[PDB]
């Protein structure tokens, strides 16, 4: 509350560390469904169904331009990528499986880096 603060967690390396995580997601072999925005002219249903599209390139641009206020808003966009993928793709598809695998990979890196 006013003039009463919990001790200051060092957040000065968060930007660099989110960048490193994102590089590791970018270079994973199962990243291919997620590297670029879904082409809304060429994929029927996507525009109407997926209210907030997200992809790695879009996260990389937001990161590089100071559009994440803190590391939690960065994790929310990453998870949005996987949540979208589960919304649109059967679990038993190449892309459905890619999404589960990438989410697992992300969540481990997140915990090991920050928890």
UniProtKB/Swiss-Prot annotation:
Residues 9-113 form the Bromo domain. It is found in: Nucleus. Signal peptide: none annotated. Expressed at varying levels in several tissues, whereas a smaller transcript was expressed specifically in testis. Component of the BRF-1 ISWI chromatin remodeling complex, at least composed of SMARCA1 and BAZ2B, which regulates the spacing of histone octamers on the DNA template to facilitate access to DNA. Within the BRF-1 ISWI chromatin remodeling complex interacts with SMARCA1; the interaction is direct. Component of the BRF-5 ISWI chromatin remodeling complex, at least composed of SMARCA5/SNF2H and BAZ2B, which regulates the spacing of histone octamers on the DNA template to facilitate access to DNA. Regulatory subunit of the ATP-dependent BRF-1 and BRF-5 ISWI chromatin remodeling complexes, which form ordered nucleosome arrays on chromatin and facilitate access to DNA during DNA-templated processes such as DNA replication, transcription, and repair. Both complexes regulate the spacing of nucleosomes along the chromatin and have the ability to slide mononucleosomes to the center of a DNA template. The BRF-1 ISWI chromatin remodeling complex has a lower ATP hydrolysis rate than the BRF-5 ISWI chromatin remodeling complex. Belongs to the WAL family. This is Bromodomain adjacent to zinc finger domain protein 2B. It comes from Homo sapiens (Human).
């Amino acid at each position: 509350s006013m003039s009463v603060k919990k001790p200051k967690r060092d957040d000065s390396k968060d930007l660099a560390l989110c960048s490193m995580i994102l590089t590791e997601m970018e270079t994973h072999e199962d990243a291919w469904p997620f590297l670029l925005p879904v082409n809304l002219k060429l994929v029927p249903g996507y525009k109407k169904v997926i209210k907030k599209p997200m992809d790695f390139s879009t996260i990389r641009e937001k990161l590089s331009s100071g559009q994440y206020p803190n590391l939690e808003t960065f994790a929310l966009d990453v998870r949005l990528v996987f949540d979208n993928c589960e919304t649109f793709n059967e679990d038993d598809s190449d892309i459905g499986r890619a999404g589960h695998n990438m989410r697992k990979y992300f969540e481990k890196k997140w915990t090991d880096t920050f928890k």
